[PDB]
């Protein structure tokens, strides 16, 4: 009856079907502290999806079969009542409430049941979103009297959106904050899961493979959370061993190269950082080794805990920052131009940092949470900073001291891993780490050969003629350059002379 | 028999009770192509209401009777499936089970039946479903394993709501796009229907009235 909507976690614990939890036994003690109450003995595990909240009550179910519980929690059977399974297959009036009363009938009958309602935010809005009888209004009488012990588990956002907004429901449940682990806490989690892996995958897992699964998932994965995405890396590591046995750290770096997409895995590449930055920039090599120099300190050596990863003034400029973003964690598209020449007024200062609520631009601006700290590292370029109002880069004085921006929607976006670069008061300039000077005919013609080879490599692959002359590279150097300005986007001169006459080859 | 739970659409075609469709030959042969396939052998005729989806298979019934048909489906009796008469009088337990098994064994008994289910969305989700399996779940294994070829006709909207709901239908039905006629094709339709309306109203209909009625509509 109650087996039709979830499994018995206590019966799975005494059959050894549950993964052991190492650490978070202060969280399990807090849940027992709620469950041993009289009146509202219903904990809700507040977390975020993958920190281990099923794992908390998986450890509570193991604690019951070990007898490490109070006398009000011994011989209790935990059932992961999926209330979404109660909604599923319920097309009719009253069909939903019938298989919830069958569940609550076995609560009254057994008397030793602790429901684990995963995704407790679903409890509001199971029949009518509190407009009528939902699954919340069915449970709220028995939850308030301690006659139904229910462990909820929900995200902190979903606790605020659904459980806190129903003020009658929030008193029935007691928030047990299950925090995201630390990396050193994740490694000792995976030590006890080594026995579960080696029995299943037929692998042997070395010691630092855990270290390269927990540090490395924190470094490149930010959508997922610690004690899940690191289990994922050891999972996908044996999924390369099912293609084949000892896993490496390179075995985890392989399967994160599948997941995130970057293959770059820092001391070796930081020394010859210049050469991987020369592959897109030839000419003006003094600034290349200059922005290589300060970053050899920040990512190798000593660093303040509250600073961006280098700060620069640029006075190609933006082509170097795109190659700088490619070395930074492995992606070309991390460079975000703000175009500070598109803002001149004081009321437009809220159009790039977020609006105060109620006002225009509450989402045009204030999306920086989903941009900057969504990526593990970033380079934010402020193109034409001299055209802005003073009031706009008074707000950039936060992120040069601390590396924190307060969105207009109330979010703290950390710029502490972001290379903040300005491009053209003494208080604004001394917080910037460097002043890097770009100098404005032999350097242009070498960028001609760099940029025609990207086009011509594809051209002859589709059986097209390649007719070039080194004298004509100097003709590309005259138009695609400006002393008063800057090398008139040579690429526009290449599509002038080469790509327009590319049509005049089939004719 | 299928004559009690439907009507012979080719016997209606040889008794001259189906309206001729002058034009529409590309879509009648389209149905005959996607009957002769191996994986989606079921034409479902999608189209907006009024474009002549039923008139395609009635034009197919006239194609079989006239002999304008391949001799893989020559003398192949089209029966439209009246779901009304199939449900009607199923007052006792397992009648609608038994009736729909009878009309499917009568197809396999003779083999000169190609079945047309008008409003194929009505088949999905209705017919006996309280204490027995419905109409669609009886058709479903003979459409999946293959013992039975329907011709279907849904609305373009009703095709997405009921047939494109489960994937195991989608890999057996081929949507035949029965589009709107253009105005010039409609004049060809109306000039071909002219004898049926000159005889019913005993009026004459000019060529102007045909090109007016297609352009002005």
């Amino acid at each position: 009856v109650l087996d039709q909507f979830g499994r018995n976690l206590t019966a799975a614990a005494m059959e050894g079907k549950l993964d052991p939890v190492i650490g978070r036994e202060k969280e399990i003690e807090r849940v027992m502290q709620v469950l041993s109450r009289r009146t509202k003995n219903n904990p809700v595990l507040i977390g975020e999806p993958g920190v281990g909240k099923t794992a908390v009550v998986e450890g509570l179910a193991q604690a019951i079969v070990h007898g490490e519980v109070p006398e009000t929690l011994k011989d209790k059977q935990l059932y992961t009542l999926d209330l979404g399974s109660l909604v599923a297959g319920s097309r009719y009036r009253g069909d939903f409430e019938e298989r919830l009363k069958k569940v609550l009938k076995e609560i009254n009958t057994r008397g030793d049941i602790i429901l684990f309602i995963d995704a407790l935010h679903t409890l509001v809005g199971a029949g009518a979103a509190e407009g009528a009888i939902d699954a919340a209004s069915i449970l709220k009488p028995k939850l308030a009297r301690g006659e139904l012990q229910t462990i909820g588990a929900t995200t902190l956002d979903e606790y605020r959106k659904y459980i806190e907004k129903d003020a009658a429901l929030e008193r029935r449940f007691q928030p047990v904050q299950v925090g995201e682990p630390t990396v050193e806490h994740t490694i000792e989690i995976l030590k006890g899961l080594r026995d579960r892996y080696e029995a299943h995958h037929r692998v042997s897992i070395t010691d630092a493979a855990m270290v390269a699964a927990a540090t490395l998932a924190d470094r490149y994965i930010n959508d997922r959370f610690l004690p899940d995405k690191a289990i994922d890396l050891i999972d996908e590591a044996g999924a390369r061993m099912r293609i084949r046995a000892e896993v490496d750290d390179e075995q985890i770096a392989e399967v994160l190269g599948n997941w995130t997409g970057i293959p770059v895995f820092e001391t070796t590449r930081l020394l010859r950082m210049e050469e991987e930055l020369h592959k897109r920039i030839i000419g003006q090599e003094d600034a290349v080794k200059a922005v290589s120099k300060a970053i050899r300190r920040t990512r190798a050596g000593l660093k303040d805990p509250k600073r961006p990863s280098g700060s620069f003034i640029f006075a190609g400029k933006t082509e170097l920052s795109k190659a700088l973003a490619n070395f930074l964690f492995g992606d070309d598209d991390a460079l975000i131009q703000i175009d500070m020449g598109e803002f001149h007024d004081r009321f437009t200062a809220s159009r790039l940092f977020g609006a105060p609520p109620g006002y225009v631009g509450y989402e045009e601006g204030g999306q920086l949470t989903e941009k900057v700290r969504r990526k593990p590292f970033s380079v934010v370029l402020f193109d034409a900073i001299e055209k802005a109002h003073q009031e706009i880069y008074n707000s950039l004085l936060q992120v040069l001291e601390d590396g924190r921006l307060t969105d207009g929607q109330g979010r703290t976006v950390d710029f502490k891993n972001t290379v903040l670069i300005f491009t053209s008061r003494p208080e604004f300039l001394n917080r910037i780490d460097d002043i890097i000077v770009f100098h404005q005919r032999e350097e242009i013609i070498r960028m001609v050969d760099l940029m025609i080879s990207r086009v011509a490599g594809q051209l002859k692959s589709k059986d097209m003629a390649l007719v070039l002359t080194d004298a004509a590279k100097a003709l590309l150097a005259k138009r695609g350059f400006d002393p008063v300005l800057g090398a008139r986007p040579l690429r526009r001169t290449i599509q002038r002379e080469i790509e327009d006459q590319l049509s005049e080859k089939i004719l | 028999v299928l004559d009690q739970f439907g009507r012979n659409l080719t016997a209606a075609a040889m008794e001259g009770k189906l309206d001729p469709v002058i034009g529409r030959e590309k879509e009648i042969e389209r149905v005959m192509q996607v009957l002769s396939r191996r994986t989606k052998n079921n034409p479902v005729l999608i189209g907006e209401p009024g474009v002549g989806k039923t008139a395609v298979v009635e034009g197919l019934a006239q194609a079989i009777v006239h002999g304008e048909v391949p001799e893989t489906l020559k003398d192949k009796q089209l029966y439209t499936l009246d779901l009304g008469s199939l449900v009607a009088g199923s007052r006792y337990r397992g009648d609608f089970e038994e009736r729909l098994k009878k009309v499917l064994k009568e197809i396999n008994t003779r083999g000169d039946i190609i079945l047309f289910i008008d409003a194929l969305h009505t088949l999905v989700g209705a017919g006996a479903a309280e204490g027995a399996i419905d109409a669609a779940s009886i058709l479903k294994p003979k459409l999946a394993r293959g013992e039975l070829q329907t011709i279907g006709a849904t609305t373009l909207d009703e095709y997405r709501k009921y047939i494109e709901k489960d994937a195991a239908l989608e890999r057996r039905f081929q949507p035949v796009q029965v589009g709107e006629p253009t105005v010039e094709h409609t004049i060809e339709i109306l000039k071909g229907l002219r004898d049926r309306y000159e005889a019913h109203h005993r009026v004459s209909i000019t060529d102007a009235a045909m090109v007016a009625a297609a352009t002005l509509a």
Partner: peptide, 23 residues
């Protein structure tokens, strides 16, 4: 300075329905 537009949805109204017995 700018409205929010709550934009109330309509619901499907989970239905009772009569059924048909057969003896």
């Amino acid at each position: 300075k700018v409205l929010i537009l709550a934009c109330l949805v309509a619901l499907a109204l989970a239905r009772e329905l009569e059924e048909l017995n057969v003896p």
